[PDB]
């Protein structure tokens, strides 16, 4: 029967509420109990505070008016205000003290995900303080998780005026009794209830959630830890740069601050970073998530050498050049991991810092042809399979759904070994026609990749493997160097191909190397352990990249 | 006969040269004359410095080696090195002391513009110092102005080795005697001369330029002040955001740092900011230059109300939301100017700062229908012409070349009055079929705009004028407010439509308003006085937006 959920902000999605600082400040300065509240509410519907909540005046216009009200309130209660009493200072501290109430946000998320229309209905102000950005950021972080955010000052109405609920009901396209509305002020509930809305007086978060659990019949309290926020491709800023006449790079861009450039592996997509993209934006960074050369909406010229590391790197440099970036942090995984290491080696002036998921930095062996080197490790037999232009393409492009559903599996869910692939004559010779969907990906997520590879298929991605000799020669020019820029290596316990021990001697070449390890994590690091990944990268960026 | 120009970096495009700090440091610390040079050059072709210039080692690898060389040089000359003598410190100060040599850069520009292939040929290093970004930035600023930048450490060769000149001649696709090469070190010229290149030993910049003037037969010294760098559309990072199901905004993006969002007027384009885009990137900003709703590669839905200020603003907010920006600086001109003021008024939390070129902030008259208000000023008669859907479109879309060549004129070059346009029955009734090209724009620049408007024509742009009533009603909700966020107004002496005196009472509503004035500047502010515009905006951003 219930189809919509409405959440107050102050005292519901964000804690502590600011009327909570009103009261503390009083005790703090030993003023008359509730004096600051009287001043705040002075004149009711025609008072400074209503005119503010309605958008008639801005916050900075209201501050002196509140000063007056406190002068008048203090005069009538026969007390003096303290030396250097300041409404701006009190309200600054207050506003910046409030933080997202994680459990509530997460409950709203859950409800949204099980089909509810969610909204924030709040009395709030046009904030023009020097320090306004703080709140802007909060409001951003929150709004992206809700169908609507209705703000008193944007619509000209306030709680408890009954007109705002009519506006509410109308925005929701719902009837009074399909809505649950949670708010910390009883008065605000009063008219919601009159129209027939389920309401919840929010005191402690957990009881509110219990009532909301009981009334919606959906588990919200004590639910398992949720995944990090993902990206809807069609809500992203998509960017395009021609690095040279035939070749354009596509990227997706979110957040602001230092530039972090995300370099996916084989056979993937900018989408492989869906769980990192918001987290890093959120953490104060300018995420640029690439479609690497050969993939997605990036160009896929057919020639093999268009994909050697040197050309790939020169091209990432031009990418920075034309976008006007003097540096970026480079974070890569799988093949993208190889590339960021080579970026640190041949363009350190352009790399603020470098990090790889899974891909070790192993220097080339100048006394051993790299093809010979690769036969030395049976776990790498599939790379030989990839050599002959066309063979691997035909297997991979034959069923796209099949392919990704086969590759994109967690460690304990495997359906393919990379063992004797040449012998067997293929990657999927001994794996199902219709694989079960792994617990790591939804049906829709598989289709995304499917629709991407429909553009160019696998020639371009596969070409990344088809320059062993050219890349070796080039790498050898760098045997004299060391990586002395900040550098993080992250190993995945259960990557059976890029195994953690391959990284063991990396400190010989990267002396200040910082490390992270992820237990119980297969080869598809980002989607397998998104939470652990974000935690490791955000901590490392914060200490090494600012 | 001469077809290419090559410029050294250190001591030619960038001053002071670092061997210049080598020598000063000696005197400074009263060391043996030239001791630091011997150390620097120790072992010639097999010495630390060559291995570095060739890319065998990184800068940070070389630093201790140079320390040793200075220990050995000082021991052999029988002197002690000072307490806390430090190669890193000397070279940091040095590298960061060098600045672009404007006259040389400008000379190279000129030559490029008259058809020369230009290159930088430099001995340089893979820089991995903590402070490497400084040089990266220089190298960026410079490279964008040259066909090639060949770096010793990227190609494995150095000046004076003859192989680098062969590589040079080959990259240029030119023969020894079509090349002029200017360098500050005589030895580097030696092999250029052997192959038959015109060379120039660069001591003082002006004499070098005189020789280069004499030898190319092109004026380089004492030439008039050049325009700011422009943008080639196809070298830009182009971005796309869907703000809602039918509607996408296109923008061009350059630089990094605080987000500055550029909002063009009627009937224009992101391109109208071509002279601002590099300047601001250069000045440390993230320029986002819009195609506004209805223009260029942005959507152009046909309905009139899709273009009222409220919807336009809500849409710019969604633009920030999806791009992950909590604020941006908004800079607008003409209609874009109206919009940024309304952004400051209805979304100050999202506006870091606001600035308008030409467009005053005049608050709505709540006692006078805006159509009536517009008949009160004969200079605004053309806006009435624009009311009737279709009329203005047919005139404007009939000859696109004609239209922009007619509009885009400097003040003293006018071919149309905005006077009695209704009476006359059109904007161009009394103006030429084929106008002369104004001194403000090239033929190619006019074609760009032409090709843009071919996508949607003028319905969408014209609709911006077709919400007088709706916009008025909305504006009236804001009569109580003031703009208290940082705000710059820039008037144009010779804008005969948006005249400077229209801005006279703006301080009543914007108390901290900062002002700029441009003399001898028509309505198309950005292309008419690009240099003055960049100077005003960059100074104001630096003080009010950081
Ligand atoms: O090829 C892979 C990943 C494979 C594992 C599963 C399918 C692709 N790694 C690398 N090879 C070379 C450098 S990084
Ligand atoms: O219409 C213009 C500019 C015109 C002058 C030359 C052609 C267009 N200004 C504005 N009107 C309303 C707000 S800003
Ligand atoms: Mg509340
Ligand atoms: Mg030099």
Could you please describe the fold and organization of this structure?
Chains A, B: Mg(2+) binds at residues 8, 10, 184. Chains A, B: Pfam families: Abhydrolase_1, Hydrolase. Chains A, B: Its cofactor is Mg(2+). Two copies of one chain form a homodimer. By secondary structure, chain A is an alpha/beta fold. The first copy, chain A, has three domains: 1-16 and 97-217, Rossmann fold; 17-96, Putative phosphatase, domain 2 (DNA polymerase, domain 1, Orthogonal Bundle), CATH 1.10.150; 236-546, 3-Layer(aba) Sandwich (Rossmann fold). Chain A contains 24 helices and 15 strands. In chain A, the strands form three sheets. Chain A has an eight-stranded mixed β-sheet with strand order 8-9-11-10-12-13-14-15, with helices on both faces. A five-stranded parallel β-sheet of chain A has the order 5-4-1-6-7, with helices on both faces. A two-stranded antiparallel ribbon of chain A has the order 2-3. In chain A, β12 (328-333), α14 (335-346) and β13 (351-357) form a beta-alpha-beta unit. The first copy, chain A, is elongated, with a radius of gyration of 28 Å. Chain A starts with a strand and ends with a helix. At the A-B interface, α7, β8 and α13 of A face α7, β8 and α13 of B. β8 (237-244) of chain A pairs antiparallel with β8 of chain B, so a sheet runs across the interface. Residues 266, 334-335, 338, 359, 407, 497-498, 523 of chain B line the site of one 2-cyclopentyl-N-(1,3-thiazol-2-yl)acetamide (S0C). One magnesium ion is lined by residues 8, 10-11, 17, 183-185 of chain B.
């Amino acid at each position: 029967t219930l189809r919509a959920a409405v959440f107050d902000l102050d005292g519901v999605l964000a804690l502590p509420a600011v009327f909570g600082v009103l009261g503390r400040t009083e005790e703090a300065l030993a003023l008359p109990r509730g004096l600051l509240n009287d001043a705040f509410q002075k004149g009711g519907p025609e008072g400074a505070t209503t005119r503010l909540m309605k958008g008639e005046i801005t916050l900075s216009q209201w501050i002196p008016l509140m000063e007056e009200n406190c002068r008048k309130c203090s005069e009538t209660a026969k007390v003096c205000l303290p030396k250097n009493f300041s409404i701006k200072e009190i309200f600054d501290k207050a506003i910046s003290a409030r933080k997202i109430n994680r459990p509530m946000l997460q409950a709203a998320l859950m409800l949204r995900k099980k089909g509810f229309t969610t909204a924030i209905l709040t009395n709030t102000w046009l904030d023009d303080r020097a320090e306004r950005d703080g709140l802007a950021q909060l409001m951003c972080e929150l709004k992206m998780h809700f169908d609507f955010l209705i703000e008193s000052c944007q619509v000209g109405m306030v709680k408890p005026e009954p007109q705002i609920y009519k506006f509410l009901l109308d925005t929701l396209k719902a009837s009074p009794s399909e809505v649950v509305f949670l708010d910390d002020i009883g008065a605000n509930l009063k008219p919601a209830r009159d129209l027939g809305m389920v309401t919840i007086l929010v005191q402690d978060t957990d009881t509110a959630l219990k009532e909301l659990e009981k009334v919606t019949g959906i588990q919200l309290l004590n639910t398992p830890a949720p995944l990090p926020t993902s990206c809807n491709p069609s809500d992203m800023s998509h960017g395009y740069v021609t690095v040279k006449p035939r070749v354009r790079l596509h990227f997706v861009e979110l957040g602001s601050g230092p530039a972090v450039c995300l370099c996916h592996g084989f056979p993937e997509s900018w989408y492989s970073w869906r769980y990192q993209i918001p987290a890093l934006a959120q953490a104060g960074y300018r995420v640029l998530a690439m479609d690497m050369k050969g993939y997605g909406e990036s160009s896929a010229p057919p020639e093999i050498e268009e994909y050697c590391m040197e050309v790939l790197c020169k091209e990432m440099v031009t990418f920075l050049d034309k976008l006007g970036l003097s540096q970026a942090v480079f974070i890569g995984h799988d093949w993208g991991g190889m590339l960021v290491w080579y970026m640190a080696l041949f363009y350190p002036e352009r790399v603020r810092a470098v990090a790889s998921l899974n891909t070790p930095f192993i220097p080339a062996n100048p006394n051993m042809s790299p093809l010979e080197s690769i036969k030395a490790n049976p776990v790498f037999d599939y790379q030989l399979y990839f050599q002959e232009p066309g063979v691997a393409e035909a297997e991979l492009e034959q069923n796209l759904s099949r392919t990704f559903k086969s590759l994109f599996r967690a460690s304990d869910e495997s359906v393919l070994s990379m063992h004797k692939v040449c012998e067997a004559g293929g990657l999927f010779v001994n794996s199902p026609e219709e694989p079960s969907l792994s617990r790591m990906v939804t049906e829709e997520e598989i289709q995304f990749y499917v629709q991407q590879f429909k553009k160019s298929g696998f020639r371009g991605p596969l070409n990344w493997y088809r320059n062993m000799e050219r890349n070796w020669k080039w790498a050898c020019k760098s045997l004299g160097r060391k990586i002395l820029i900040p550098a993080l290596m992250v190993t995945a316990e259960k990557d059976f191909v890029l195994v953690p021990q391959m990284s063991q001697h990396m400190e010989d070449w990267i002396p200040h190397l910082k490390r992270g390890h992820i237990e119980d994590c297969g080869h598809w690091t980002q989607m397998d352990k998104p939470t652990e990944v974000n935690q490791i990268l955000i901590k490392w960026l914060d200490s090494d990249a600012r």
